[PDB]
């Protein structure tokens, strides 16, 4: 290689090299000071400014400090404001700025930086691809879709753009349309396409249209390290946790919780029925595109280890009962919720995002016929007042063909083999 030195910078290369050598040798504090001195003496030097930013970046890593990193992010921008900045340096500085803004969770800031990059380098397709990711990270699928449509208009066979366009189409329930983009994108082998998210959604789109090739893609995704197995396809995992579709209470160790749910199941049922009868708007329809058809709604008391205070006003005894069990109330990768499903419902085969939880189901109102749940290769039914336990990281599927409603209580627990240290440090999902 990159050309990072402007005319003046070539005249001070000896000083610039001396400072960078300190950085490369790990003398970060000395390197910071060396580049700070260069920025003082040569305030317009783009290479000196970039060196200062790189040292602040390394220092932020050394001190694990977001504030130090915020300084680097500003200095990376200062490089771009200086006169006569070489094109290669301008791109490197603003790209790293955007990347570090994303690390900090400053997604709107990264977006503005990525927008500037595309304006400065209009023919760089990689930068537009990066802008699309910026929109995806903030949840703006509509603008991300338009970015990848622009990329595919000029480079139709860009595989990064194909898989991401396919991902967006799938999210919008354009299943058939998404398959060729996801498939051709993965097959391109372009950098960024060998990603478990695209294998996950290609196979799922294929399953939804009845394409039996789905599991060849799950097999390949497993062989390439994205899935623990063809059946267990979660992407936010702690490696090595016991992997089994169905669990007994004793196997989980959470026997006191299970005893409490089964001994007190009728109070849990009754509060759920009262909400159905007098506060039915607390049941929210499932909103993750997991239904082929039918009506399925959830009343959530806990999510991400956080109690919903207003919801617990609707099930106060159930919330009081459950507060004695932090193995569920503190499961920041699970929920506690009522789940109602009505006749004519089919839930698509799907997997949850993480192997770090197990999912308990307490039967509350179970019709005598028509309701069942498959996990992996094994299908079961619910019983009123009894707990079933499965690992939702394994593919599972549900049918409701009874002649009345089916109500269960879903209680997520931390995987029993996760230590307290792990349970405290895993990011919430």
């Amino acid at each position: 290689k990159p050309k990072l030195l402007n005319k003046f910078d070539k005249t001070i290369k000896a000083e610039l090299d001396a400072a960078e050598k300190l950085r490369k040798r790990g003398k970060i504090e000395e390197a910071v000071n060396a580049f700070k001195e260069l920025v003082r003496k040569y305030p317009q030097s783009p290479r000196a400014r970039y060196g200062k930013a790189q040292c602040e970046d390394d220092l932020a890593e050394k001190r694990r400090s977001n504030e130090v990193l915020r300084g680097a992010i500003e200095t990376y921008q200062e490089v771009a404001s200086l006169p006569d900045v070489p094109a290669d340096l301008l791109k490197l500085s603003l790209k790293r700025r955007s990347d570090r803004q994303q690390f900090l969770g400053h997604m709107r800031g990264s977006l503005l930086t990525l927008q500037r990059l595309v304006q400065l380098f209009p023919n760089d397709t990689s930068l537009k691809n990066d802008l699309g990711v910026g929109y995806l990270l903030i949840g703006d699928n509509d603008n991300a879709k338009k970015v990848y449509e622009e990329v595919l208009s000029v480079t139709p066979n860009d595989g990064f753009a194909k898989v991401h366009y396919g991902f967006i189409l799938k999210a919008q329930n354009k299943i058939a349309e998404s398959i060729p983009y996801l498939k051709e994108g993965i097959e391109s082998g372009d950098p960024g396409t060998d990603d478990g998210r695209f294998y996950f959604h290609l196979g799922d789109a294929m399953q939804r249209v009845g394409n039996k090739e789905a599991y060849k893609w799950y097999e390949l995704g497993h062989k390439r390290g994205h899935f623990a197995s063809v059946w267990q396809r979660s992407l936010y995992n702690v490696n090595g946790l016991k992997a089994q579709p169905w669990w007994t209470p004793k196997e989980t160790g959470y026997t006191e919780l299970v005893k409490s749910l089964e001994r007190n199941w009728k109070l849990i049922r009754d509060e759920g029925l009262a909400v159905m009868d007098k506060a039915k708007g607390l049941f929210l329809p499932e909103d993750e595109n997991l239904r082929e058809k039918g009506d399925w709604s959830q009343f959530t008391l806990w999510q991400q280890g956080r109690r919903n205070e207003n919801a617990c006003k609707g099930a106060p005894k159930t919330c009081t009962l459950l507060e004695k069990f932090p193995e569920t109330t503190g499961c920041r990768r699970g929920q506690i919720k009522y789940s109602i499903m009505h006749p004519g419902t089919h839930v698509w085969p799907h997997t949850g995002p993480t192997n770090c939880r197990l999912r308990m189901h307490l039967g509350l109102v179970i019709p005598k016929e028509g309701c069942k749940i498959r996990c992996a290769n094994e299908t079961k039914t619910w019983e009123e007042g009894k707990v079933l336990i499965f690992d939702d990281s394994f593919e599972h599927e549900v049918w409701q063909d009874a002649s009345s409603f089916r109500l269960i209580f879903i209680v997520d627990v931390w995987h029993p083999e996760l230590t307290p240290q792990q349970r405290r440090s895993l990011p919430a999902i």
């Binding site: 995806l136 990270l137 992407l235 936010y236 993750e288 799907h350 995002p353 919430a428």
Partner: peptide, 18 residues
């Protein structure tokens, strides 16, 4: 949106730096 029950979002965790 949150990845409550599937993997429908591009990312399922929040970004908070160090």
């Amino acid at each position: 949106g949150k990845c409550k029950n599937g993997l429908g979002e591009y990312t399922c965790t929040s970004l908070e730096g160090f």
